[PDB]
């Protein structure tokens, strides 16, 4: 019998800052126990200061990204070159995904950018189109490895202040872009160590008012 | 293109009349007269065949009176071929109702269905209307004995006594004169024949130029019988009523 689905591995991570937002993803692409590519870009600049990644079955991921990019283009045509806001993009993606409710895109989608007040924004989707704005979200193969670390080191969960013993929580002080990139790099270094589908390279896309910047870092190739 | 040749059968005149309906009624006014008379104990249907021949096989012939079911019959005035199309539809509608509700179709519901079909041809589709007028004679347990008529417009009305086809103006006047509410079938038989005998364009009214039918409760106990008269039976009733 023909199986229309496959698993290409990989992992992605979105973090929202005070006036910025990052969307990272490893560059490794696999099937079963073989590597297809050590560098296959997975996070994409879709225009309007919006970055996107659809992790899981790559053929469905590429299809979805391709159709959203197309949606941005037709949004400009139909509404006098209006900038597509991150919240509007998110709702549009819900309908793209749910449109194939009974033959789903087999992907975990994350988008990132700035909201209309300039503050950092990250949205997360399931395969059939449900979504939710978040401060923090890892997706894909090693999502179970990374998320707990991000609950602890981004949202200071289960952390309290010395001397008070469980009475006073650690205050939720804001994190700079330099501080977030440190946490992203460590998250992937750790994920690479313990997950066989993660490795080769890390590509981070940073989003600010000035635009979309890129940073690349080497990861272990075993 | 094709627009050039379209007669536009479903349009209003400046006066707000439907051209094709009006012209179809003109056609029907030349058809053989058909009369329906309703009595307390039954209904009579009488109708004149159009200029026949001695070589026409009468006993196996049917152009005027048709059976829709065991309780309902119709007298036709107009194009016989058009009428048979509608008759077969009406026969099916009756059987559909019987299958659905396990009860014989009420007369009015059957009449409304046929009349709605006729209406459709006047409002949409671009086709010519049916050149037919019916007299419906029927019985059901709600209203008892009933007479209706329908015409190419798809409009229908109920009657105590009514005529369609040729010389209706003269026929309706005669019926209006001699009809009474407490009348019986035997009397209504005589009235129907006498009215035809006076309105006919022929020299004399004979058995070979007529089609006759009664719907009587004159069936053994609480039930209804349809009688389509045979040639010899029409000849006998003509002698009995004193016309020949």
């Amino acid at each position: 019998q023909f199986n229309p689905y496959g698993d290409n591995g990989g992992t992605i991570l979105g973090i929202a800052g005070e006036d910025f937002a990052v969307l990272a993803g490893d560059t490794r692409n696999i099937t079963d126990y073989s590597i297809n590519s050590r560098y296959e870009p997975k996070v994409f600049d879709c225009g309007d200061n919006i970055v996107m990644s659809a992790n899981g079955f790559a053929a469905d991921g590429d299809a979805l990204v391709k159709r959203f990019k197309n949606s941005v283009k037709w949004y400009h045509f139909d509404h006098n070159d209006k900038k597509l806001s991150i919240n509007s993009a998110a709702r549009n993606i819900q309908h793209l995904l749910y449109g194939k409710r009974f033959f789903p895109y087999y992907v975990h989608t994350i988008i990132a950018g700035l909201d209309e007040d300039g503050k950092g924004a990250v949205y997360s989707f399931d395969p059939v189109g449900s979504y939710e704005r978040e401060q923090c979200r890892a997706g894909g193969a090693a999502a179970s490895l990374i998320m707990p670390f991000l609950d602890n080191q981004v949202n200071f969960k289960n952390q309290y202040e010395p001397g008070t013993n469980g009475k006073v929580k650690k205050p939720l002080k804001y994190l700079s872009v330099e501080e977030v990139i440190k946490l992203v790099r460590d998250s992937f270094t750790s994920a690479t160590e313990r997950h066989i589908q993660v490795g080769d390279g890390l590509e981070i896309l940073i989003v600010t008012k000035d635009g979309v910047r890129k940073e690349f870092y080497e990861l272990k190739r075993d | 293109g094709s627009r050039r040749y379209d007669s536009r059968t479903t349009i209003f005149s400046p006066e707000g009349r439907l051209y094709q309906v009006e012209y179809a009624l003109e056609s029907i006014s030349h058809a053989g007269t058909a009369i329906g008379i309703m009595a307390s104990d039954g209904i009579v249907l009488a109708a004149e065949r159009k200029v026949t021949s001695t070589l026409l096989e009468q006993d196996t012939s049917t152009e005027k009176l048709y059976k829709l079911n065991d309780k309902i019959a119709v007298a036709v005035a107009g194009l016989t071929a058009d009428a048979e199309i509608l008759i077969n539809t009406a026969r099916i509608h009756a059987q559909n109702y019987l299958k659905t509700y396990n009860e014989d179709i009420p007369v009015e519901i059957l009449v409304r269905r046929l009349s709605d079909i006729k209406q459709g041809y006047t409002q949409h589709g671009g086709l010519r209307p049916f050149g037919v007028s019916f007299i419906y004679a029927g019985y059901d347990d709600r209203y008892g004995y009933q007479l209706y008529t329908s015409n190419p417009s798809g409009n229908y009305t109920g009657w105590k006594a009514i005529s369609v086809g040729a010389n209706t103006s003269a026929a309706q006047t005669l019926l209006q004169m001699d009809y009474k509410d407490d009348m019986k079938v035997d009397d209504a038989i005589e009235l129907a024949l006498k009215t035809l005998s006076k309105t006919t364009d022929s020299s004399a009214l004979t058995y070979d130029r007529l089609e006759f039918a009664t719907i009587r409760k004159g069936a053994n106990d609480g039930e209804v019988y349809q009688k389509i008269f045979k040639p010899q039976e029409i000849k006998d009733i003509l002698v009995k009523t004193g016309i020949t």
């Binding site: - | 079911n69 026969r91 059987q95 019987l98 299958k99």
Partner: protein, 204 residues
Amino acid sequence: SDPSSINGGIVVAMTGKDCVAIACDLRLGSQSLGVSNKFEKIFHYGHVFLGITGLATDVTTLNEMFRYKTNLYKLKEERAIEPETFTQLVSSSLYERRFGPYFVGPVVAGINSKSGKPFIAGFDLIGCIDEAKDFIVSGTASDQLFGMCESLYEPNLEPEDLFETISQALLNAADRDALSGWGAVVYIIKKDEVVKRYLKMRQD
């Protein structure tokens, strides 16, 4: 699960000297549960009689379908349908549902009004005609009915003698079937009189 044996029931028909007989049980059930003891399975359209076993909803549906068709036939033809002609109509109607069939076992019985010749016929659920000289059986106790008929039957039985034979064939066959019984009816049919008799039988 098997549609033909959810409700249960039987029909049998026989020929005699210038006569025919058709009979049926009165049970309708939902597998083990007995529901109705007044579910007659023999219907008639003019002088042509039709018995139908099998799934009860289809028994009712087909009766209503053949009443529909025989009523149109009579209006157009200006005569009652004959057994031979009706048999062909049943076959045609069943085969049109070849790949979504009515789960039934029909039986036709009647005397041709012109020739006077007795006539019976049976069908499978999809239209095949069995036209026997002697007898036709149908239903959940068809095996039992075959055994009774094959031993009890003789040709050229008088109407009143034929009644006894067909009744004993039905009764004893029904008593060996869990899904049949709960009463029975027999139709004796002559050229211009038809007698209907309800039989006293065990109600378990």
